[PDB]
From Swiss-Prot:
It comes from Homo sapiens (Human). One of its GO terms (biological process) is intraciliary transport. GO terms for molecular function: ubiquitin-like ligase-substrate adaptor activity. This is Dynein assembly factor with WD repeat domains 1. One of its GO terms (cellular component) is extracellular region. Signal peptide: none annotated. WD repeats lie at residues 10-49, 52-94, 95-134, 137-176, 179-218, 221-260, 263-304, 306-335. Belongs to the WD repeat WDR69 family. The gene is DAW1. It is found in: Cytoplasm, Cytoskeleton, Flagellum basal body; Cytoplasm, Cytoskeleton, Flagellum axoneme.
Length: 335
């Protein structure tokens, strides 16, 4: 069971993304106010404010597990890198020829890979400051992010109905996953990193082999667009969020649908498992952030407080706390 603590209104102009640190201590918030602000979960104090960008900061993440540095991607040429210790601007990355919307880091806190709407992805060096490689293999916007454990590969999802699997080693395409009939929402690796789970706007979720890049499974059930898809910490199960307004739970190995999650008055935006793998969290357009059991299908709790749609919802890494970003430019914590 979860409850509201109090309310924290992050900004008054539109909020882009919410992301927490590994132990749950910290969560970052970006917005249309050209800024990224640094909040901690316990105090609620805005630790630092990250100013310097000339536009809306959209894609932000933590250096998790390490969580000692911050990168921010914005609606310009820019990617900036900060530390969490001090709020100053460290590294400069310019070169993308369109809005930068998707970024993620590498194992060992290597360097940074940025997915931008310039139809390209780029790898930039950080201890040094170089862009080292340009990943050109898409005909459309890159919107999704993933790194495999060990960081040998990077999968780039795009609006051209294709996933391209790059190798961080060479910087060339390993294989190109083809089969989706509409824009791809999300994609990430499982525990083994042998299988890739993709979702798309063509009512389908597809399950690919990481080895050769062959499509092992095609999952049916949703009646409209798919907005998100996820494995859990174990990789045994599969969760899919859709614009059908329903949430579906499959098997990794059997792929027969195990359960349907219903009770929604709206678009389902986000999906995520707890670190334990026993309940499941949903943020949606209607009134809600809701919590389900992965095996029942029953809604264990509906917890409210936001005044409009919820685009973000995530556990911390031991399921201690839950954080949600909404369209009312407010982030709420649930203990």
């Amino acid at each position: 069971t979860f409850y509201l603590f109090k309310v924290l209104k992050a900004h008054i102009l539109p909020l882009t993304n919410v992301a927490l640190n590994k132990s749950g201590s910290c969560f970052i918030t970006g917005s249309y106010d050209r800024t990224c602000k640094l909040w901690d979960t316990a105090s609620g104090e805005e630790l630092n404010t990250l100013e310097g960008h000339r536009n809306v900061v959209y894609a932000i993440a933590f250096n998790n597990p390490y969580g000692d540095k911050i990168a921010t991607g914005s609606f310009d040429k820019t990617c900036k890198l900060w530390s969490v210790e001090t709020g100053k601007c460290y590294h400069t990355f310019r070169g993308h020829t369109a809005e930068i919307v998707c970024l993620s880091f590498n194992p060992q806190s290597t360097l940074v890979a940025t997915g931008s709407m310039d139809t390209t992805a780029k790898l930039w060096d950080i201890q040094n400051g170089e862009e080292v490689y340009t990943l050109r293999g898409h005909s459309a916007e890159i919107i999704s992010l993933s790194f495999n454990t060990s960081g040998d590969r990077i999968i780039t999802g795009s609006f051209d109905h294709t996933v391209v699997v790059w190798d961080a080693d060479t910087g060339r395409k390993v294989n190109i996953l083809i089969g989706h009939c509409a824009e791809i929402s999300s994609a990430s690796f499982n525990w083994d990193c042998s299988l890739i789970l993709t979702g798309s706007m063509d009512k389908t979720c597809k399950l690919w082999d990481a080895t050769n890049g062959k499509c092992v499974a095609t999952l049916t059930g949703h009646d409209d667009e798919i907005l998100d898809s996820c494995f859990d910490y174990t990789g045994k199960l599969i969760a899919t969020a859709s614009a059908d307004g329903t949430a579906r739970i499959f098997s990794a190995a059997t792929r027969k649908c195990i359960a349907k999650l219903e009770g929604h008055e709206g678009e389902i935006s986000k999906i995520s498992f707890n670190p334990q793998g026993n309940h499941l969290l949903t943020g949606s357009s209607d009134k809600t952030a809701r919590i389900w059991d992965a095996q029942t299908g029953q809604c264990l709790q509906v917890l409210e407080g936001h005044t409009d749609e919820i685009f973000s919802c995530a556990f911390n890494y031991k399921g201690n706390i839950v954080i949600t970003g909404s369209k009312d430019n407010t982030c709420r914590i649930w203990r």
